[model samples]
Target chain A: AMVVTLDGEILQPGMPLLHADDLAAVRGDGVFETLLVRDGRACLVEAHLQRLTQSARLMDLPEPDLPRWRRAVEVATQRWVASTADEGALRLIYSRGREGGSAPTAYVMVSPVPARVIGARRDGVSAITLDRGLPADGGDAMPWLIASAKTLSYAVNMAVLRHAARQGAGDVIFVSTDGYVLEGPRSTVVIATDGPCLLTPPPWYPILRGTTQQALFEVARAKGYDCDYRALRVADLFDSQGIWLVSSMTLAARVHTLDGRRLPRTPIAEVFAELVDAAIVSDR
Target chain B: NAMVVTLDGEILQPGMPLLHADDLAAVRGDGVFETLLVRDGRACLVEAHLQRLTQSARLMDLPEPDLPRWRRAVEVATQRWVASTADEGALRLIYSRGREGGSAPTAYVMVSPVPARVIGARRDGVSAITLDRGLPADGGDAMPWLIASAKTLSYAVNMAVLRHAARQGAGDVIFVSTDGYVLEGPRSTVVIATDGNPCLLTPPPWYPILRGTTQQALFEVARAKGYDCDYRALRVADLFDSQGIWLVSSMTLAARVHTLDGRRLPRTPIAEVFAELVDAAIVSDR
Candidate 1:
């Protein structure tokens, strides 16, 4: 992994990166965006940038200079790709306020995509339904900052993922204590078959609206699939003929097992794979 | 205010103190404790330190150092008092953690106090209420990093109170959401007079709430007034009917108010005098 300082100077992996005061590191007061850079371009750059800006606004963070940010990501990605033989992931973190100042700090890093994500698409994945609940949404009370923005306060999400890994599962699906199925820890929940194609737990659920997941929905609809947003429950994952976790890098990986119980192999996997493959190819 | 560095060196205000990498600022991410020193002795020293340490632990940070470590605080206090004039309110800050590269970072700093708190408390104190309905308490499923702890990153709670104040014609908050039970504010809890004795609504042990130092100080006063831990759920009406309402803090001393929830409250008459007396007694014993 490579670290880029706040001044846009790239540092070696072992070089220490002095974090800004209270910039998410101190109080988790920040937001971030992860983009998939294929070949030399960051795919869905505009969408990701817009999402990042929206998240920053929601968190009351200073508006991110998107033009400069995009350039920084591009420069970091190009340098990383040139240094490495294979493609990798680029993560950009924008924090509110400096160590003791009010200026926002930006840190860019590049690392190779995890092997589990790459391997899961080929040989399916198993997931569990964690019964953790979402914060109650209030009318004027900041609209539940946790729900809308992808804030840097992701320690809870990471903890849930760690629990899932300990349980021998690839991912964990967040279901509200009310049993309303939310998105995955790092992915969106897309349950569709030959009939209806709708992402479960709409944007109102306040989960980070996955960029690639939305793109895949457009791709699936263009390929003659009816797509819409709907509420999904844990029971739906067991009853549905197919379940897939969608994200930028993974595209879509079918869930072969739910809460340790295996599901029947469905043909929807091939269709979803074809849609993602076509989407990536068209973008290229 | 005098700035005390991590190495026990005295510096001018706005000066940067030397800090070790593995200090509390680095490891376990400890919280801070600020106390007001009245005269030569520390005012509410034990309460402030205990609250700070408890808040740190609640945030999953390290516990307060052993008795020997606490002695360092006294040493700092002696130096601070010697350097300051009498009648000046000295501020003592205890940040746990030592130098870098050590197995543990037990760094803490103590400085001369400021006058903002005392002046604010002397004036017509503010009002607040239970802001519940959000910030759930379930661990492992949500941001369960001890919301009750008085960590340094208290911007969120402070913001929540500010939002509450914007809606309610008040300066502070006494947050009580759907939980029905009364909870403290971002800084202190609402210590009401119950049956002519000072009492505070207790928070559930499992929940993330700061173990209040000021409340404990009042608890001593309550003991003197023939009262024990009433630790019962208090409602808005109960709070209004109380004989006197005050926000007790290490620095605020005792903020007695004349009103709560539109009801005109009678002055504490002697609450402030008693609070100072109690604090002085506690500090001297310590």
Candidate 2:
């Protein structure tokens, strides 16, 4: 059975778990985070919670009941531990709840990682750069755009991913309308230059400062590799030695091709993944 | 108590999950919706709101909403609202991209008593501040993904703007595009009238302000009553000299702008006149 907890209550996965009028259910007015679960333990629980609270505040959401959240997530993970689930994923969702009635609605669940994500990890992915249609820093200063927040408003990001899928691509790297590589739909972007350096797009824009990418960068720096955070142009993507789209789920999916152009594979890319695995402890 | 019912109009059970974690509305805010007022057991401008519902679905590339089911749902909710307490409440119709494994759209209606602040906004005009919506007025025409014209549920930023206003002791906010043209309210549309020009004006839909159904009804009445009505983008500079300025929506009808940036606006007779037309149109439909 898929492990689940809804509003601090144990629930079977098949049953509906949200109220009809919950803001997250009705208006998508909520925040969430997904982390990797391996060998019965959660990866980066503390970092995920930090970002979850950050995403919540971006929507003017109050801080969630942290003790209850931790308890519910622990309960759900224990069930996953007993189940035959492999390479599971854990999600913590805090919805603004039903308007004028109660506090925020929170839920947690553990499920096996999908085959597609596994495939991406094994064989990597092909990506296309889609115009997220805003300047890189354009929405960073505005309140209404909320473009970069990891809020539940994800249709556009998912649409662009599906947009790439139509062209036989598996993922997307959003470019600013004026020409700058932003972040991936569900991942942070990393690039490699001839110096074997690691570079990522800065949080200068509304793009998410990726936890996985940040940790990977930290590991890379400790290994004596040059790492920098700055803008890498789309031309730089074409001219780079290699590129990788990093996320918590796939860990690190090397971008094989962008917009029908083939990019070279490097030993550094494989080593990067190996080091990432060593850095994130699953307590196995 | 506020009641939530399904398409066939049965009360939802407590702790029943009407939504899935992967449901687009939960994950992506991928949907369109409409909210209309119900008073004295009658749904105001029901057909117009239904038509707007179709417009939103079309823009979002969803299947057409089931009108009869929606009408039936509203009927049940209005009856409940009248029976429960005051003969007044809000009937919200939401259509969302459904569960993860399938692409079927989720449809439902929820009923809640109209909030006192909403009624109060209608009773007393609001002080509003303008914030940049982070786009040129023409942004929506070229960008469907902005989804500005369609009333989808991706309103976190919109909600944040209002919260910004509330903290500053203001009642509402009017968004200004980066290009400096006035836009609509977070939940309402902007309407303005200049005394000499019989032309009742709102920023046109190409500017991608949502076509407010209340504004539509009021415009039609005003036009037929021998006033000119048209769509023209107005600048912030024009707010100081306008004969009247107001925020229009289904719930508030039309609330005059008492202040913009904390400065008093030129008060006018136009708000009451248009509100009367709105009231007549609302009742005529029922």
Best by TM-score: 2
Model-by-model DockQ, in order? 0.14, 0.55
Interface RMSD of 2: 2.3
After the best TM-score superposition of candidate 2, give how far the Cα of residue A27 lies from its true spot, in angstroms.
Answer: 2.1
- Of the candidates shown, which would achieve the greatest lDDT relative to the real structure? 2
Alpha-carbon RMSD, each predicted model: 5.9, 2.6
List TM-scores of chain B, every candidate: 0.71, 0.93
Q: Which lDDT tens digits does candidate 2 get at residues A8-106?
A: 677754666666777876677888888888777788877778888878777778886677778877887877877765777888777788877668777
Off by over 4 Å in 2: A1-3, A143-148, A166-168, A282-284, B13-17, B20-22, B283-286
* Model 2: per-residue Cα lDDT at residue B81: 72
Model 1 residue B226 distance off true place after TM-score fit, in angstroms: 3.3
lDDT of 2 at B207: 78
